[PDB]
Design a protein around this ligand. Sequence first.
Ligand SMILES: [Zn+2]
Ligand SMILES: [Zn+2]
Lengths: 66, 49, 56, 44
Amino acid sequence: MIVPVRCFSCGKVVGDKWESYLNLLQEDELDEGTALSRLGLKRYCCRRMILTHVDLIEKFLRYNPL
Amino acid sequence: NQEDSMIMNQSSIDRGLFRSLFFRSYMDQEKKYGMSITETFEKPQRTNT
Amino acid sequence: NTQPTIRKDGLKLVGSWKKDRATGDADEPELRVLSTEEILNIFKHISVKDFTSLGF
Amino acid sequence: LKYICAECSSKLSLSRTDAVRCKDCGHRILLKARTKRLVQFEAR
Ligand SMILES: [Zn+2]
Ligand SMILES: [Zn+2]
């Protein structure tokens, strides 16, 4: 259930930043706050989704398909 | 919004807010009476049933 | 596949593929003349040990 | 191009009164081979 696009509030292109956020939070062990700030999401309107999105697709893909 | 009603953004709905899947299923199988006088699963013709 | 019964008439060989694979009984066999070429072809495919079993 | 069952997805292509069980495995599932046709969905 991938990261959505076009913040419901604003509509800015969101989701292209998903990989950057994931790695940045991982190899740089920064907080989300500075992470999103340097990501460039000044408004909190966008901030909510990246803050509270769960990529279920991983748990989905575990199944052997077909 | 009067009396517990509310308003929501059309544009937000467009962008995906509160979108939902919806699944229904159906049940069916053959029948036995013998001496197998049973039914079938095929497109019946107009002059058949 | 189902081997049809073979009947003899004059100098020809005919087969009756009853085939009954419909849900209904569908009593409807096919009377097809066995074209000699297909018989020759199927004979060409017989195993050698069959000849010994079949006395050839 | 007619029938596929679980985890051994080979073209079963069965027709009628033809041993519903999978040839390959003992599965009894036989998904129904999504159509070759084409469909229209709206972007909205
Ligand atoms: Zn936003
Ligand atoms: Zn199978």
